């Protein structure tokens, strides 16, 4: 459990001099919070006689098969996990403010596109009083930026 | 893992659209309100707090409905003309947003809420309940 | 000195005796029901539990009313048909006596309660509310 | 210059360079004087693609 200062109020409002009084502004909030932790479990079986007289070790393989499946599933859940018995991810809960890029024309049609304007506008539009901020994108998406061409043909 | 949060903090209905209800705060030692709407509002909407006494016929049955004098804190600028407590749901409260409030000095054995006169049309759209905090027995 | 307990475990109406009400439980991580009868009952009354899903059109309005899957624990020895969360208010439950319970495994976005077929007439004399608990929102 | 067949007067950077280098260097070194808006006018010119 943890606290989250929601907002400050406002108290010091300008007033005229010749009066011996003041004005009670409004106070803020504290908004105590909480949160849980979820579990990850499962089982499998072998066969005494099969595993014993087998070509090679099958057990240790399943061990590594669990640690990685746990590893990849956690990160995958941490991003897009639906609240129920899974950590609510930052993709799907739609709490982050999300932009969208308006389409372009082609031969009279109108197709959705992702120009070089967007990525330069998107990254440079982030409140400068929150500090620096890294970005994330899939390798192919960056491979889309690299191979961009202007009207003549130059990169 | 959710705890059985009904074996403490047990709530009861206080205003289900068109019917008030006495809710005993005798044993418990702390209690508030949770105002939640079901539709849009039209104008402002007030509510009148009350309290009751154990009737002489049976010490476990509601008596009459007496109001609650609003005790002021520090830094109060206005007091209702009669000095009786009153809570108002401000205009423009969307029906997916709960409001919270409580009277700062308990008196009696149980509480009651009712729409202030002339403001009983919107009153239907409101739903009020009361939670608790202690046991004492 | 009674703390405002509206915030920090508010409550909402789940079954007002006439119609059910879905109560959002997404922003909170714990919840429970506080039953309360208004009059003398006739026969054992049971209630069916339902959980909902965010509608594909609007992500914070009710969808359909899916049925919560009942889950046993260590010493559960009388699971009903196929498993469905269904609590039963026993008889010999006079008024001014609240009973409370909850469902162990949460699922969906919010819960709704409705009288089981065969107990709707008795259920017109009962009230059910929920008091969530704490969580981040 | 013929803006869509209208022939408005104009003054473009090609004029300035051709005007200042034409000074016969046998007279000496010469300084040019002008109003600061004109220099602002030169500094804001654009070629058809849009660059400065």
């Amino acid at each position: 459990t943890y606290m989250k200062i929601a907002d400050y109020g406002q108290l010091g409002e300008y007033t005229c001099d010749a009066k011996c009084d003041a004005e009670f502004g409004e106070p803020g909030n504290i908004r105590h919070l909480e949160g849980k932790t979820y579990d990850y479990r499962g089982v499998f079986c072998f066969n005494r006689k099969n595993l014993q007289e087998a070509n090679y070790d099958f057990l240790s393989f399943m061990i590594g098969a669990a640690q990685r499946s746990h590893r990849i599933n956690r990160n995958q859940a941490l991003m897009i996990g639906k609240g129920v018995n899974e950590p609510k991810g930052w993709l799907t809960e739609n709490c982050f403010p999300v932009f969208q890029t308006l389409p372009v024309d082609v031969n009279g049609t109108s197709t959705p596109a992702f120009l070089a304007q967007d990525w330069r506008r998107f990254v440079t539009s982030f409140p400068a009083e929150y500090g620096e901020a890294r970005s994330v994108m899939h390798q192919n998406v960056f491979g889309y930026l690299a191979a961009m061409v202007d009207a003549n043909g130059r990169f | 893992m959710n705890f059985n949060v009904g074996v403490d903090f047990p709530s009861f209905i206080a205003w289900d659209g068109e019917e008030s209800f006495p809710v005993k705060v005798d044993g418990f030692n702390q209690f508030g309100f949770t105002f939640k709407t079901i539709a849009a509002l039209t104008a402002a909407t007030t509510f009148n707090i009350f309290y009751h006494e154990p009737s002489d016929a049976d010490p476990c049955v509601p008596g009459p409905a007496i109001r609650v004098p609003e005790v002021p804190f520090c830094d109060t600028v206005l007091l209702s003309e009669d000095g009786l407590a009153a809570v108002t749901l401000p205009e423009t409260v969307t029906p997916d947003s709960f409001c919270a409030g409580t009277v700062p000095c308990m008196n009696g054995q149980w509480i009651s809420i009712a729409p202030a006169t002339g403001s009983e049309t919107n009153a239907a759209n409101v739903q009020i309940t009361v939670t608790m905090k202690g046991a004492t027995r | 000195m009674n703390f405002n307990v509206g915030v920090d475990f508010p409550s909402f109406i789940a079954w007002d005796g006439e119609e059910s009400f879905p109560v959002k439980v997404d922003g909170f991580n714990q919840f429970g029901f506080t039953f309360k009868t208004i009059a003398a009952l006739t026969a054992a009354t049971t209630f069916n539990i339902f959980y909902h899903e965010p509608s594909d059109a609007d992500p914070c309005v009710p969808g359909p009313a899916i049925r919560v899957p009942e889950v046993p624990f260590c010493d559960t020895v009388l699971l009903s048909e196929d498993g469905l969360a269904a609590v039963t208010l026993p008889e010999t439950v006079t008024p001014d006596s609240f009973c409370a319970g909850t469902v162990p495994c949460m699922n969906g976005q919010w819960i709704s309660i409705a009288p089981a077929t065969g107990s709707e007439t008795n259920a017109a004399n009962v009230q059910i509310t929920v008091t969530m608990k704490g969580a981040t929102r | 210059v013929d803006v869509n067949g209208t022939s408005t007067p104009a003054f473009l950077a090609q004029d300035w360079r051709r005007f200042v280098t034409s000074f016969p260097a046998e007279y000496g070194e010469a300084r040019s004087v002008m109003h600061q808006n004109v220099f602002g006018y030169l500094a804001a010119m654009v070629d058809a693609n849009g660059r400065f």
């Binding site: 969208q100 120009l115 | 002021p72 809570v87 997916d96 | 405002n4 | -």
Partner: peptide, 28 residues
């Protein structure tokens, strides 16, 4: 004196059009 304290339950999804400068067109 009741101190009403109110929060919203569901946050409505947002979507902002990330408009950008149109292509350069001469004035004339």
């Amino acid at each position: 004196m009741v101190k009403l304290n109110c929060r919203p339950l569901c946050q409505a999804p947002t979507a902002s059009r990330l408009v950008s400068p149109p292509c350069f067109i001469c004035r004339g």
